[PDB]
Structure formats: structure tokens, C-alpha cells
């Protein structure tokens, strides 16, 4: 996370730390499911990978001490394409814990979204993560607060750069080329989190998915709302 | 020859169709009042019949009716229970109320209030609505206890 | 039972002893049901606990084994207690509060699945703790009786100017020249046929009614025609 | 600021992705081979992570891996079991065969009779290849008296 601040204990109690092919993030759903990005498990470019998953603290060293949480199962969404370099369609996956976690003040799941107003122009949301800072590595969770961006303007920007990346209705974009705040390497798989103004319930509206570089652009996120049925169907127990 | 008139040992034993005389080959059944069970030594009985044998003696000695005990209530994952009734007493008519570890879990629902379980005549814990099956506590999502922004009166 | 023999332990392991409004019988089904006659629970005159004993041939020893409490009763909807020459639907089902443990002296009888169990001249057994020709019985007895021609049974009643109901849901066994019959205390026990093709024992009937006891035709609730009802009541 | 190379205390302990060097903030996970569970003291663990601290010391002492135990097989109403394997041993790969009290009871069926075989599996519970964890069912047999009045003979 660039241009962010240190998270305090209890701020983002759903946040997950993974170390599969490198650092990444996720969000607790229920007491035994982790939502994240599929590219975190099946990377684009490319050593052989363990499902390492730590929960329940903001300090990377304390998270590790609390112990790994073994993954019983993985579901990658059928539309994801590992081999296509500029197409993050369906960049969403689901990890099932072998054992459910006990909930508390520092460990609580995030809700899923139920309507399209979570994606309105200028709605502010939060991205927390253990990813890289502008000039150094992060040893604690950090976060930024970013506006949902006009997807027409995001298109304009990709086009000005002559990029042919898939930018679909199952993705949205946040931040702004003028803003320093963004996700970076290690933040992928974390959620873009919106506090419903009418309800005070926190909701995972997106998953940190892709961009061009890090700061000072638009970031792209998997539109969680469009997979809520698929998520619910995999959690069906 | 006739057998002695049957002999109740406590207030909770019933003798069905008590006969004025009892002769050879006759029998009587003993049962209990709602919520009590037949006991003989340290052993619980499903039924009791005494048979008047050819020598004027009952083949078997009158049991007792002791209050039924439902046992320790089943544990509730991510919850607990409190007694509305004497602390620790798991006997007939005892009452407990299950509850969940709020605000982190919430009791699954649907007619409140009913995490309520009384220890019934059948000697098992039961809820009016739910029956023998215990409640279920479910994760509560999106309600951080130390949130970064939150609404305020 | 009149003109029969002492049963041996194990001969009729489904046999049940009731004492509700007097002595009666039944047969075990499964490990917690008892099939019997409605009129055993709801007699014609009468105008009463459910005492049920199982697992032995000697009445004293049946009682020492102990009563088996009854949780639910099902009488067939067609039984009419208050008419007096009408045993239509004389079948009922007792459910035990607790299932019994099966053993050599305690096993259930099967239900019939076709009409050849009622063929003219087929031999079956009726066991019971009922009264004998000249004494009370203190041990299970049995006789072996032939399935009878329903036309002749009708003829025999027509001969006595009797208006009793003899439906398609009943059959008759025995013969007016035979001494062998069920008697007082035998009602509610089964007519049992050993299938010759199978070696399995089947409750084709339930001792129901007659005109006195010996030397006549006996009438039995036709179990085959209530099998669907038995299974439905057995599945709550 | 380095940590000692990780130390395997038995043949059943696996260290996932062992590193040559281990430094502050790094970590390792210990698991066991199929059938064995992590032990520390006399306590079972679901997982094990050891973090390399800033003084050069692992924050946690390597556990052990010992054979899983499915426990006493569950009781079979109106049946029993016998071991095909060492008597009273309920450890990984142990095998029992359930049976019912015949001829009074008969085991419920369908597949078919490699019948009530349950083996103590990698996951530490008793399972049958067809029915899984659920145990068999012994059902009353009807119409087969042991001392019948007539019966067929050869």
C-alpha cells in the first residue's frame, strides 16, 4: 500500500495474509472461508507453491506466530485464464480452511454486497494490505481510502496508453492518476472495502486485481457483486 | 395362598389397577408420576412387573421412583448457557437459556425468546420450538469493534 | 386353543401376550410393533391398561420377563365397536415405547405380499394362550388349521340364520368337523403360514371372531388387505 | 541476524520448502506424512509455524509427529466388530469388520458384501470405502424362527 497509514488492531479484522508465490492478501468470510484473487494462486508470469495463510493480527511477525491456517480446498472461478497476460476476467478465488477460526475483536468476516450502489461514482472505500510501500517493505498492515472511479475515464486512460487489457463489466476501477494512494506488490487478493453509509456494515465490493504500475493511475478490481451467487454456491454446506 | 398387598415406598410410585386380593399367577405393574423413573439398586428400569409365585411370595421387590435427570446440557459451539433454575441442577422441570458469544456470533432464528430449554418428563432437554436439537451460533459479518469510521449519535 | 399342543420355546417367537380387557394375543412386527385385533382394545361388550408381555411360552415366566409399555395405539378406521356382529376392520397396531432385543425366543413375523396365502386348503398355525377344551392354559399352545372355502363358510352361517358381516377383508379357517380352534384368550394372535417356496413365516390373518369355539369355522382379519395401512402407521 | 537450520526430531515430520539460510522475519511450516499428527507436550496441534526472531532464535521449539488414532470404533446397535488387524489397535491403517447379530438381525445393504469393512484413515477417523464415516445398520429379520414347527431340510 502506497500513501497509506498503519492499520490499528481491530480496523480490518477480516484481513488475511497469504504467502503462496509471494505476499498477497484476502478477506475472511464466515468463520472458515477466505476470498482472494485467483492470480494469487495461478500467477500470470510464473518455484513451487504452498498455501500459506495467516490471520488475526496487523503485525506480520505476530500474524506468523499465531500460526498458519491449513487450507482444505481451493476454488478458482471458471473464467480465469492463467495463460492470458492482459486479461484478469474472473480474478477471484475461494480458500476453505480445514478448521474454522474462533471469532473475536481482532478476527471477524466481511459481508458480501447485495446491490449495485456499492459501485457509484465517488463512493469512498478502503484497501488495507501488507504490500510494498513507496520506498520500503511493510512489516505491518496499512491502508488507504480511495474513490470509486468513472469507468469511462478509466477506459480513456488505458486508451491513452494504447493498452488492450480486458476491462469488463465484472471489474471496476478506483483511485485517480492524480492520487498517490494505491495498492502495490503484496496487496493483491485483499478487498476493496466499503462501509455502507445506511447500515454501518462493512462490505467487500472488490478484490485488488490489476493495474499499470502502482501509484498515480487507476487500479482495477474484481466486481465482487457479480460473483456473489458463485461465492454462495461454493460456501453451500 | 395369597400374596401380600403391594407396598409403595415413596410418593411418586403408582400401582396400576391395585387389586384387593392377589393370588398365585396374578401380577401388578408399577410406574411413576410424570418425570420420575423406576429405580432398583443403582439401576434404572423401563418397566416393572411383580408376579405372585406359588408360595405366596412376590418374585421381585418393589422398586422406587426417583426424579429424572437430563444430564449436562449439550455444549453450544460459540455459545454457552445459564440456569434460570438452581445452578447445576439437571432434573425434571429444570430450565436453561442458551446464548451466543455476541456481538461476534448471533443465534440462528425462526418465536423469541427461545434459546430456552427445559428438562422435560422424557428426561431430555427440549425447546418448545426447536425440540432436542440445540441452537446454532453463526458468524456476524461487517461489524468491527474498532472500526476506522463509524456512525455516531 | 382347543385340541392343540404345547408350543416349544422358539416355535412362535413373534407371539405376544396381552391383558387389556382380559387375556389376548398379538404378533411382533419389526422390533417395536405389535399387530393385534381391534376388539382386544375396544370390545363389543364391554360397554384397562395396555399390559403387553413377550419372549416366552410360559405365562408366569412371560410376566417375570416384565411388561413392555405402549407408546401409541392405532386401531383401523373401519372397526365399529358398538355393532355386534360386524368385525370389519378388526385390526390394530401397538407401538412399544422401547424396541425389544431380538433373540431365539423373540423374532417378528413377516407380512404377506400376495393372494396365494389364502388358497383353499393351505395349512397355517394359530398359537395362543387362550382357554382349552376343559382347562385354563398356562403355556402357549398351537393348532394347525386349513384355510377354508369362503363359499362354505357363507353356507354355514346361512344355515344358522346369522347376519354377521363376512367381508372380502376376512377369511375363514378350520372346519366344522375339526376340534381344533382358537378360543377365549386367543383373539389378536395371528394365523401364521409357512411359505413353502421361501421357508419364511407370514401373518396372513388375525384371530377375530366365530360362533363359539370348537367345531365350526373360525374367521380371521385378512392381513394382506391392510399391509399398506400397517406400513404407513409403522413410518410416523 | 541468522537462525539455526531447522531440526527434524523424527522421520514423520516434513518441513515445507526448507531454506538454506533463515533470517529475521522469515518462517517455516512443519507438517506430517499421511496418517500422523503434530504433537507438542501431550497436546495435538492443527498446524505449526516457527518465526525467526531478531535475536537469532526460533520463537518456537520443533514439535513431533506421531501416528493418528481413530479411537474406539462406535458401537453398532445389535451388532459388534472384530479387528482384521492387531487387536485393540486403533491407529492409522487399522481395519475392523462390523457384523450384526445373525440370524436375528441382518446388515442393511447397497455395491455389496466386502460388507462392513472400516479402516482408520489418514484423516484420523473410521471410514468404509462406500458408506464413509456413517456406521452400518442392523435390521430385524422376520419369519425365520430358530426352532420352527416345520422347516425344510435336504
Curated annotation (Swiss-Prot), chain C:
It comes from the Eukaryota. The lineage of its organism: Eukaryota, Metazoa, Chordata, Craniata, Vertebrata. Disulfide bonds join 153-172, 183-213. Residues 1-235 form the Peptidase S1 domain. Glycans are attached at residue 114. This is Complement C1r subcomponent light chain. Coiled coil: none annotated. The chain holds residues 464 to 703 of 705 of the full protein. It comes from Homo sapiens. The active site is at 39 (charge relay system), 90 (charge relay system), 187 (charge relay system).
